[PDB]
């Protein structure tokens, strides 16, 4: 999960980029996010597009 | 074969198996331009001790 | 025997044997002339703590 997080903020970045240039949030926002336990973590990829 | 990956003999358990080495980045590369950080493999594949 | 290997002798539970030793470097030696940080080892072989 954490190689899915830096890939989350990563994509999101370029996503965010990509689609709405004036904004300058995920390249320059510092970002708290907290994601609820329980599943396994070999499931856990199929989080990350959420 | 897409460059990263290779057919490689295998001696199964019974036979043979023309089994095919993976290989792929798998988390971006750039977690900084200037950074001097490793490119720490994980292997997966039910790893063996050796 | 090139650079950085060399031979050496080791009583196996059974019998002797006559095993090298190998050796190399592992990543750029120069991401910074002067930079300040360890030449770490980085040893393998199942060794024990001994």
């Not at chain 1, 904004?23 to 996010?33: A, E, G, K």
């Not at chain 2, 950080?37 to 050796?50: A, C, I, M, P, R």
Request: with cysteine; net charge negative; aromatic share 6%.
């Amino acid at each position: 999960m954490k190689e899915s997080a830096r890939i989350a903020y990563t994509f999101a970045r370029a996503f965010l980029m990509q689609h709405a240039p004036a904004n300058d949030y995920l390249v320059t926002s510092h970002i708290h996010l907290h994601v609820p336990e329980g599943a396994t973590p070999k499931d856990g990829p199929s989080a990350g597009c959420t | 074969t897409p460059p990263g990956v290779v057919m490689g003999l295998a001696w199964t358990a019974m036979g043979g198996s023309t089994l095919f080495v993976e290989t792929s980045l798998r988390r971006p590369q750039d977690k900084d331009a200037k950074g001097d950080k490793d490119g720490s493999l994980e292997v997966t594949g039910q790893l063996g001790e050796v």
